[PDB]
Design a protein around this ligand. Structure first.
Ligand SMILES: [Mg+2]
Ligand SMILES: [Mg+2]
Ligand SMILES: [Mg+2]
Ligand SMILES: [Zn+2]
Ligand SMILES: [Zn+2]
Lengths: 97, 94, 146, 177, 39, 99, 87, 160, 38
């Protein structure tokens, strides 16, 4: 009836000591998300259904405020940069794993 | 082939199709997709964790920015689990 | 208790009175607080105890009648003032800014326009120096000044 | 977890929309947990250049509570930089003008004073009442628990609690009360 | 945890005179002991 | 000169980042950083801050095991402090002795 | 010019409607808003009514200028300082 | 009848933290035995894969797995291409179980095998001292010798 | 009122009241005895 932590969010941690007492053994199988805890996946007569291509060009001000409102950022991220920094940027960065 | 994954070495097109064919040929029910976890949704950067279930039992779960790509990634995870090429599998004995 | 009515005819009657619970854990105590082992174990939240020790109209009962000692009486008085300001006694009323731990009366403090240097800073008092001696249950003591 | 690399990165660095309630909460305790969640310091993948803050939605900011006499003592100062721009308003006056200003200013003071601060502020969302927009309400995950414990007014006590608490003293039978 | 380690007699720094700091770091894969560390 | 002194600053900042991430993971499991660290040292588990943050990120189940172990050691210490007598030492509060 | 008039809900009039001068009546009080006569860039005497400097008695090229614009302790000029500009 | 010491339920009467009762030691010891036996049967069967280990080496702690690389910052008196046994294993873990030493795991339990694959020098590190108006400027350049090891294998044995 | 640091009752009718955070000496019969604490 004792549990050091709740056993319902990541894994079922069971602690143990060996009989000599020199090593600690942890048994932690994962917890699976239940079916009951999930949620189901959400679901011109005479002419062609013409594809609706409109791209209203917006000025720098309205475009930056639209981007900033959509991504919850400030305008300063969207304003451009100069040629000094543009050529300072590393376009072949090192990549690990 | 040490540090690469299955669908970086072997390109596939319809992981859901491959998964349902495998489940049909090993005689279990067709997997049901359900939205296990969800963040955002009305934003431009959502997170969807879609799980694949069989007889009300979880066989896979996968993340994505949309529900469809989350379902596709969950299908890929299920295929890796069935084929045995999983990320925490036993490394090669040299 | 005792009531008086007017109708001119005025008369008083004796009505039913509550009694102490039968077996106190410390029968050798003097005040009811000392008797029931509550010496440092109550705050302004404990409106059950404070409602035992107040009048029907929010005022306070005196010492010769409550049996309280002086330290306990002053502590109950401050707890009752803080409870009244926190609104924890909705039915003990006389005759919107939400508060708790309010030491002074809200219409008598002037705003701190000039805080001092940080060696001579003007602090805002919170709580009560009479309730300074309560049980801490913490490795950091009560902060009486914010 | 056997994910692909791009979905694994998306899952690791995805943003979460936490929900926080006002209703008798100190603005600074609300602000401490809001600043933690807005910076991303609750994540173990935290780094200050990892841009790993999340969205915090605080409601009922009109019903916050100040301990002590801070409603009448605490002064917010600003200066419209014209000669004579110095304004000093009490927390009461500021609350009666703008019912999100106190919580907003507390969170603003607790966030780090760099060029990321206003970005975290624009991921902070404050609403004075129970009303939250529908898009935010479909965005939310995890209503965080309240830092204060709602000391439970006297008339809210059940009769079981009232008669379980013992009567401390005997009143004299001739007192007017 | 230095005062706890002092109370148990296990130094104060875990890099002081314990098995963790005095046992050899490695040995040859067939089982031959390593030449001793200079520290 | 900045390079030469930034070596020291690099070591200090990396320890600060490790403490931050351990704090985050411990608080996700309901513990605090002093609780976790002190009770792991009392459990004689000598994982440092670097590998503790690494386990916080890449092995969440191993970190939850460590957090449950530290929480149990904290509870054993509390129970021994309240008992104050010669009650048995506790399973995880036994100390392995070396000679 | 289009101008926006704040009205209550009971004073709504259909868009596209003509308005005349008998909307107003004699013996009443009105407020009249307009862009004033522009004077261009003007100095402090015409813009702000500064007293300026005397003509004779030794004065060098200073008859129509602002004197000190601030004090010496502040190393700046306060915002809103009256200076030459567009009137 | 109230016991002597009964304090009525107020806010400060009882401690804020919930009361915790630990398991009875003999039943808990049998539980430890059954958990260790289950994990030992898991090791015997082989229901694991991709072990990792936290290993103490060259004053440092490395979280290594199989097929790994670590860069030790000193020479290691070993020829290139040579297999050695890492021994001071603080932790070994897998999916569904981990093993923890106090402070070290026994060498009968876990074996870490690595291989010296490179012995090299670090890029030059500049040490410059400068104090102003006191003519204090010195420059030194060092290169610290280094050894790159590949972690080959992490093997656990049934010994619990 | 007169400002005092030390408030003293100069009559038998003077009474001490703490109002708006300060002590006051009020006298209903000798109004010159009115004192305000500093
Ligand atoms: Mg003139
Ligand atoms: Mg001249
Ligand atoms: Mg002239
Ligand atoms: Zn007493
Ligand atoms: Zn007088």
């Amino acid at each position: 009836t004792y549990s050091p932590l709740p056993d319902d969010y990541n894994c079922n941690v069971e602690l143990a000591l060996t009989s000599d007492g020199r090593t600690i053994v942890c048994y932690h199988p994962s917890v699976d998300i239940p079916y009951e805890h999930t949620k189901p996946i959400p679901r011109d007569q005479v002419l062609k259904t013409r594809l609706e291509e409109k791209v209203e060009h917006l000025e720098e001000g309205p475009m930056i405020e639209q981007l900033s409102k959509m991504f919850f950022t400030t305008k300063h991220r969207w304003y451009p940069h100069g040629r000094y920094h543009r050529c300072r940027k590393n376009l072949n960065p090192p990549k690990d794993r | 082939m040490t540090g690469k994954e299955l669908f970086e070495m072997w390109k596939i097109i319809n992981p859901m199709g491959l998964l349902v064919e495998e489940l049909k040929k090993r005689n279990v029910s067709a997997p049901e997709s359900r939205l296990t976890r969800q963040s955002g949704g009305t934003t431009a950067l959502p997170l969807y964790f879609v799980g694949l279930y069989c007889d009300k039992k979880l066989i896979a779960e996968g993340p994505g920015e949309t529900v469809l790509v989350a379902e596709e990634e969950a299908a890929r995870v299920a295929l890796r689990k069935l084929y045995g090429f999983t990320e925490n599998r036993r490394p090669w004995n040299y | 208790f005792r009531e008086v009515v007017e109708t001119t005819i005025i008369e008083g009657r004796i009505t039913a009175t509550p009694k102490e619970s039968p077996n106190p854990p410390n029968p050798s105590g003097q005040c009811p607080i000392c008797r029931w082992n509550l010496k440092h174990k109550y705050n302004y939240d404990d409106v059950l105890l404070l409602s035992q020790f107040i009048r029907p109209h929010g005022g306070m009962l005196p010492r010769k009648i409550t049996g309280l000692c002086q330290e306990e009486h002053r502590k109950i008085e401050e707890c009752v003032k803080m409870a009244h300001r926190a609104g924890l006694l909705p039915n003990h009323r006389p005759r919107q800014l939400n508060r708790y731990l309010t030491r002074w009366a809200p219409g008598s403090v002037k705003p701190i326009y000039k805080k001092g240097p940080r060696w001579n800073r003007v602090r805002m008092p919170v709580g009560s120096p009479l309730l300074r001696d309560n049980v801490c249950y913490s490795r950091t003591p009560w902060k009486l000044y914010h | 977890s056997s994910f692909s690399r791009a979905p694994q990165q998306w899952a690791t660095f995805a943003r979460i929309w936490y929900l926080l309630d006002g209703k008798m909460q100190p603005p600074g305790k609300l602000a401490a947990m809001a600043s933690i969640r807005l910076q991303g310091l609750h994540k173990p993948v935290y780094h200050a250049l990892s841009d790993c803050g999340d969205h915090v939605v605080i409601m009922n900011t009109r019903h916050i509570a100040f301990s002590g006499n801070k409603w009448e003592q605490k002064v917010y100062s600003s200066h419209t930089g014209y000669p004579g721009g110095f304004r000093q308003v009490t927390a009461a006056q500021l609350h009666l003008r703008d019912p999100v200003a106190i919580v907003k200013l507390a969170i603003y003071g607790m966030l780090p004073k760099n060029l990321h601060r206003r970005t975290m502020m624009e991921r902070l969302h404050l609403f004075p009442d129970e009303y939250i927009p529908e898009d935010i309400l479909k965005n939310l995950v995890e209503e965080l628990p309240q830092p204060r414990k709602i000391p439970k007014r006297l008339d809210e006590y059940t009769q079981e609690e009232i008669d379980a608490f013992p009567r401390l003293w005997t009143p004299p039978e001739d007192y007017r009360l | 945890g230095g005062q706890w380690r002092l109370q148990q007699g296990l130094a104060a720094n875990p890099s002081g005179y314990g098995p963790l700091t005095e046992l050899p770091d490695w040995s040859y894969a067939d089982g031959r002991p390593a030449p001793p560390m200079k520290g | 000169v900045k390079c030469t002194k930034a070596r020291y600053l690099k070591k200090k900042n990396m320890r600060t980042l490790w403490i931050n991430r351990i704090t985050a993971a411990s608080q996700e499991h309901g513990l605090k950083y002093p609780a976790l660290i002190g009770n792991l040292v009392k459990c004689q588990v000598e994982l440092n801050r670097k590998v503790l943050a690494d386990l916080a990120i890449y092995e969440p189940k191993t970190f939850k095991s460590l957090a449950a172990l530290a929480s149990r050691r904290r509870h054993e210490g509390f129970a021994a402090a309240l008992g104050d007598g010669k009650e048995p030492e506790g399973i995880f509060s036994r100390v392995v002795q070396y000679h | 010019t289009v101008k926006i008039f704040n009205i209550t809900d009971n004073a709504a009039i259909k868009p596209g409607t003509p308005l005349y001068a008998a909307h107003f009546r004699p013996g009443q009080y009105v407020d009249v808003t307009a862009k004033t006569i522009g004077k261009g860039f003007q100095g402090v005497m015409k813009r702000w009514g500064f007293k300026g400097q005397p003509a004779t008695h030794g004065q060098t090229k200073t008859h129509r200028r602002p004197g000190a614009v601030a004090t010496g302790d502040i190393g700046r000029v306060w915002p809103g300082t009256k200076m030459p500009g567009k009137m | 009848s109230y016991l002597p010491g009964y304090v009525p339920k107020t806010s400060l009467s009882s401690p804020p933290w919930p009361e915790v009762v630990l398991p009875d030691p003999v039943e808990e010891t049998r539980h430890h035995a059954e958990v260790v036996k289950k994990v030992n049967e898991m090791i015997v069967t082989g229901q694991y894969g991709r072990l990792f280990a936290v290993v103490h080496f060259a004053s440092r702690q490395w979280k290594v797995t199989s097929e790994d690389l670590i860069l030790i910052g000193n020479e290691l008196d070993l020829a290139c291409g040579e297999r050695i046994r890492l021994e001071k294993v603080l932790l070994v873990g897998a999916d569904n179980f981990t093993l923890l030493g106090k402070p070290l795991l026994g060498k009968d339990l876990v074996r870490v095998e690595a291989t010296v694959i490179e012995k090299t020098e670090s890029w030059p590190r500049i040490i410059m001292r400068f104090r102003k108006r006191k003519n204090f400027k010195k420059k030194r350049i060092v290169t610290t010798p280094q050894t790159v090891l590949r972690i080959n294998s992490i093997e656990i044995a049934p010994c619990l | 009122f007169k400002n005092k640091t030390v408030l003293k009752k100069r009559c038998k009718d003077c009474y001490l009241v703490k109002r708006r955070g300060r002590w006051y000496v009020y006298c209903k019969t000798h109004p010159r005895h009115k004192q305000r604490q500093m």
